[PDB]
């Protein structure tokens, strides 16, 4: 897990703008990247879950990553999640990510069918193959993919050839502990932002989360904060980062950030992919009074 | 409800054969589809959570549509599940689907996000005004969706325009007696192959599965039975089709059906995709004598 | 299991009636009873789920248990369910059972701390042991009791020595005919009154059910007619008893029934033990109707 | 009502139950734990709680060891009478005993088994806190065992009931743990969860109600200690040093496994819960063993 530690930090999981005809607004994209680097972001996650994957064809997966290459290769680290439901899908996706210079890959465990562990490593195993160098990142999200692993399924995972992270994105504190103890080197992102400052005291090293898009400063201060032991800080951002998680809760998660980054000069439209609905507009001028707070607060 | 009646009865849950690189079966897939003519089935639902949807691209989806409406359109009904957790790839499919002539579409509840019951509802909205003038079938399945429907809720979505029929994967026969008190015209679909008996009896009015590829007139037989009052048919044939649902929970339900099918030179290769494995060895004696006792009793 | 043929039933869980003051109302507990055995029911399953159990001492239930031996011991089929989450007070009901000459004990699988399977088959066979001779009636309710057990783990319980009968309140009706098919002998209840003609389809020989108490001549026309193979007559005697059950779930099963016994002059004051509540007022006039229905249905 | 609760902040072990070989009542034992724990400096002790196998006990043996807890304890250190039953009746004569023999809280569950509506789960509380006459109630969420999920609104409305001072929160949730912070600053709030203690405190619990402190509960002291000096390291070792603890635990059984210690400390006769546990597997006795020799030798 040593060689992989280059991947340690705080990376924001892209959103994947769209125009008004819910194709992909590429200018957009572009602008958005532009705005989490001058954030002073550490990496990008690209294509997650937060990026409606599940919601785009491959190409245009493949056109989001080559994007985000062409304006990012190189200033930040760039993570390509190429997770699909079929392996061959996760391949192919993998050896694009590897064609555009992507400094690792990343996929969920696949979901709706029920699989076997040792299908789920098999999963793995050939994504790692496709990607052909890149580490990569084992990514868990219990509450969404309906995949239950064990702890003792989680250290073979992590410990497969190839996989040098894991994205942990499950509110249980005590086995991110675990991983921690078990794992003294693996790089460990928090996935829920919500919980980040617990989760860095339990053992996460870094995190990849969605509201990084709009205050990703935020949680490079809470990990700054922890690091000099000054806990009263970590605590208050941690706390005013809830205040804006519990609107964007309210709103729906996604399109409440492209709607905040809409008003922040950066997202044309910012509508997420049908099935979702628009934000209530009812919602506007709270996202509106975030938008301007969070831009006088800057990065 | 009452127009869509011609939907009724039990339809088989096809499933996509794919041959030694993963690709589609064609060959295999022609062999399948009159396979299950010939056993009298009622018709096929194609495209299903059986027949692999979700390890598919919408351009293999729309080839297994398309060959199965030229070998089965008019000989028995047809409906096209288009379900994507997209809405957009959901509307294609169902263009296409109306395009290649079939009787019906259907769609999943969509998948992995949280949509809220609106969202759904706006769901089968759009999917139904691609299909453009065929019925859709409404498709729950709480265990692998994650979505949990409230009664109040099924009665809202059965109801929109153009529903036609309700696919109720759902173990809940309390709930199904419900739907059907609600809707005594609905066209009521038993999801769960290991309850059909009970199902019926509880209200539905017809099946969908995937053992009905293997076994179909079993379940025509018991829908025979119960309406005959001969219950202890009935109840013979559903313990012996449990016999075989316990052999292929334990090989793998999809894989042990191609199996089987494998058996009875119906698919050339029985593999699921990946991530699917392969069926363990140790099983093949006992699928292969399950292919040898079905063609002996069909 | 074919030594407990005689078990074979359908069964009232009977309600445990209480005053104003929370006390026993040990006039209503008999006048219940013989409204039952006036009504032409099986058998009568005592101090279980329905009765309230688990907001009474062991010797309120020890009092109740004794009442009903004295008002039924002979006439019908007495079941007494004993169980607690605690092994030792369950032996305390189970000889108490004995003593009043029950015809058979049952246990709920104990609840609230999570036990090994070993533990469970440990703590029906001390049951079974203090019961010195009267069956055991296994007792599976998932979705109250948390206990999730396995087809295996049912087979281990219902094959030990001493058990006779399975009280099956699940709606699984899968795994009640894999029962069945596995036990061809045992005396297998339907729990769920809602599904009670599914339930006998696919296994059940009888059942023990809480809406018994109001109306328990349709579940006998249910096993009448599926004997008799008019599917019509028990789908429409099972639709009237969905009607019912509807209405029941909307006002509270336990208290609704109660109520519907006040309004048939049987049970004086409708109550359960706190915490819970009263039926709500609004409701008072459909249970009354309903009570009128089932008076005139009977007569 | 919360201010006024100020004083029941702080460490506090979840007792557990001394039982013999014929699942009586062990008295001595229950003696020489209380005392044990004092003489650890626990801030106080949860008496009669989940972790003191309530559930499997009669009233009469629930107030026989509330009783014997206050002789030895009322006075040196908080005291808090777990008095939850699924029955409010029930839980009123606890209540009332509690306040007879002089402790300083009373404590309910959420009641189990049987749906409540939100409703009545408050008139439940509220009855209770009557029959406390003055005691303060500590709500007790536990959604794992008691399969009661109470919404952030409703968790809200109970604390905030006249006579609530205290949550004890037994979920792993630290999004719930900051919001209850937030709309509450100040509610003596319980980290309920032994294993996210540090983690649990950083979230917004300003103490913990745990079953492992009767083993090693200066460890938790030494982390509230460590978080409020910024000492971010030596509080990451003390959880790491307790959740290797508790995975012995959880392996071994956790009450059974901790009489089990107690036992090889010499404090507990007998190490049996109450059936239907069964005692502990004879191939963890060793670990056992060796870890409380670890302990008797970390604390001197
Ligand atoms: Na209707």
Same mark, same amino acid.
């Given at each position: 897990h040593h060689h992989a530690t280059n991947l340690r930090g705080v990376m924001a999981a892209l959103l994947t703008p769209f125009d008004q005809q819910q194709a992909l607004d590429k200018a957009s994209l572009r602008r958005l990247v532009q705005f989490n680097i001058q954030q002073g972001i550490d990496g990008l996650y690209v294509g997650g879950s937060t990026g409606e994957a599940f919601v785009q064809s491959l190409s245009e997966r493949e056109q989001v990553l080559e994007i985000v290459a062409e304006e990012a290769k190189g200033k930040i680290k760039l993570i390509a999640?190429? *997770?699909? =439901?079929?392996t061959a899908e996760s391949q192919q996706l993998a050896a694009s990510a590897k064609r555009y210079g992507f400094d690792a890959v990343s996929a969920v465990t696949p979901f709706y069918y029920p699989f076997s562990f040792e299908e789920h490593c098999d999963h793995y195993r050939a994504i790692i193959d496709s990607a052909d160098g890149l580490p990569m990142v084992v990514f868990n999200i219990?509450?969404?993919?309906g995949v239950k692993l064990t702890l003792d399924q989680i250290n073979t995972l992590v410990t497969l050839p190839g996989v040098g992270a894991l994205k942990q994105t499950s509110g249980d504190l005590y086995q991110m502990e675990q991983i921690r103890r078990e794992h003294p080197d693996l790089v460990l992102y928090? *996935?829920? !932002?919500?919980?980040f400052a617990s989760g860095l005291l339990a053992g996460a090293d870094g995190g990849i989360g969605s509201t990084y898009n709009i205050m990703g400063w935020r949680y490079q201060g809470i990990v700054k904060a922890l690091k000099e032991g000054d806990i009263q800080t970590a605590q208050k951002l941690q706390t005013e980062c809830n205040k804006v998680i519990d609107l964007l809760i309210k709103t729906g998660v996604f399109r409440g950030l492209k709607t905040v980054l809409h008003y922040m000069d950066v997202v044309s439209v910012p509508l997420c992919r @049908?099935?979702? *609905?628009? =934000? !209530?507009? @009812?919602?506007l001028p709270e996202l509106k009074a975030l938008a301007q707070q969070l831009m006088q607060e800057r990065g």
């Open positions: 999640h190429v *997770g699909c =439901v079929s219990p509450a969404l993919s928090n *996935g829920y !932002d919500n919980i @049908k099935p979702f *609905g628009p =934000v !209530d507009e @009812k919602y």
